[PDB]
Amino acid sequence: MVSAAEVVSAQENQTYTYVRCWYRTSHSKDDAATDWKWAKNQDGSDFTIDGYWWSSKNMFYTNTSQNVIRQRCEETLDLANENADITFFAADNRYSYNHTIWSNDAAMQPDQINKVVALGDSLSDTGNIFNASQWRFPNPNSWFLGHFSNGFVWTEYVAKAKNLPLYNWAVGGAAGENQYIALTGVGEQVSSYLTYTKLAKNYNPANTLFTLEFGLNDFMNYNRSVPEVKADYAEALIRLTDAGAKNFMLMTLPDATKAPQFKYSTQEEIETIRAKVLKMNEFIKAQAMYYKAQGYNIALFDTHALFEKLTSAPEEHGFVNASDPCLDINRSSSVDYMYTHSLRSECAASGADKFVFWDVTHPTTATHRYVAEKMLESSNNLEEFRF
């Protein structure tokens, strides 16, 4: 994907950069607003990281571990907030965009999972559209720093439970994301992953836990046929396994037609999408069995079955409401992502942790956490994966 000569030249172009530490300003997850500070050392001097830049979206590659960078942000911010939900990025100055930091692995690494790589849509996106929108979409007062929720997504909860770095290629389409970036498809995501990892040092793909949730963007936003979505899903698994991937967290798709935005869709539109989701889920199960029979490490979670339980009896799963958004949005219009919204009366009363949905499409961070924990329980804190 990148010649060996190009890799050497890039890796030898050594420099330094600074770290932007982001945090939730409120102690409540009802408030999505965030702010940032530069990372500092204990003596008050600026914290810097050594490494090299590369772009095919600039990634900064450093020898400094994600834990060390995280620790510097925690100490700099010195918040007594359990909901601080700290994230960090590389940045040369005040004008810089939020650049992902890749921590290079050691040459003598043990045979165990040491990072999470995510592929998918808005259900896994951690801010891929936010630099492209000049930090204006989704509005950072009502959506958590480029996440289409009031906090972390399921992949971040999974990565945190295992104390692992998470590197994200996921980006959706239900919020008008394609008015900001092109190349959002799963094949474009796998291509981008393959290109950027050639620049990494001592990269062993066998030590990566891959997460993949794909198909809802295609069925909801692009009216794509079931065979073309099945073919793209099979193609992603073929390309990843041929490039050394051994470990996957696969999942069935929740019935997206249960989301508040479908209150404003016709019955014909709803039945079309629902039928496509059901056919796709049978194919996802067949694909998981196919790779499991070949000796790959596959964890399959039935998110569809869990979501049916959650929406039919929310009171049995820690929720008061599964039909309305927490935010006071009572229509389906992508322009609403540009504005600040108040919480509806019922959600302000119960708290955002008691609602399944945050906006007309996306789940709350409590729903993301519930799914992530059910996943770890199902797989016995991921038993067929070596940690």
Ligand X SMILES: CCCCC/C=C\C/C=C\C/C=C\C/C=C\CCCC(=O)O
Which residues are tagged catalytic?
122, 359, 362
* Residue 117 binding partner per list ligand X, Mg ion, none, with a CB distance cut-off of 5 to 8 Å that depends on partner kind: none
Label residue 240 exposed, middle or buried (CB < 10 Å: 0-12, 13-18, 19+): buried
Q: How far is the CB of 231 from Mg ion (least distance, A)?
A: 4
User: For residue 126, which of 142, 113, 138, 141 has the smallest C-alpha distance?
Assistant: 138
Q: Give whichever of 37 and 239 is closer to Mg ion, judged by the CB atom.
A: 239
Could you give the angle at which helices 303-312 and 365-378 cross, rounded to 10 degrees?
Answer: 130
CA angle centred on 239, ends 236 and 244, rounded to 5°? 125
Tokens 């965030």, located at residue: 34
The answer to whether the bond into 138 is cis (omega within 30° of 0) is yes
Q: How far is the CB of 358 from ligand X (least distance, A)?
A: 9
Q: Give whichever of 151 and 363 is closer to ligand X, judged by the CB atom.
A: 363
Residues that bind ligand X (CB under 6 A): 121-123, 154, 172-174, 213, 216-217, 220-221, 251, 254, 256, 259, 303, 307, 361-363, 367-368, 371
- Phi-psi group of 65: left, alpha or beta (phi > 0 → left; psi -120 to 50 → alpha; rest → beta): beta
Stretch that binds Mg ion, among 64-72, 78-86, 223-231, 267-275 (CB under 5 A): 223-231
Binding mask 228-247 for Mg ion (x = CB under 5 A): ---xx---------------
* Residue 308 binding partner per list Mg ion, ligand X, none, with a CB distance cut-off of 5 to 8 Å that depends on partner kind: none
- d(Cα 37, Cα 168) in Å, to the nearest integer? 23
* Residue 231 binding partner per list Mg ion, ligand X, none, with a CB distance cut-off of 5 to 8 Å that depends on partner kind: Mg ion
Q: How far is the CB of 198 from ligand X (least distance, A)?
A: 28
Binding residues for Mg(2+): 177, 232, 235
Q: Give whichever of 36 and 262 is closer to ligand X, judged by the CB atom.
A: 262
User: For residue 131, which of 96, 165, 94 has the smallest C-alpha distance?
Assistant: 96
Q: Give whichever of 67 and 223 is closer to Mg ion, judged by the CB atom.
A: 223
Tokens 């909901």, located at residue: 83
Q: How far is the CB of 218 from Mg ion (least distance, A)?
A: 10
* Residue 375 binding partner per list ligand X, Mg ion, none, with a CB distance cut-off of 5 to 8 Å that depends on partner kind: none
Given a contact cutoff of 8 angstroms between Cβ atoms, the answer to whether 246 and 296 are in contact is yes
| Residues making contact with Mg ion (CB under 5 A) | 231-232
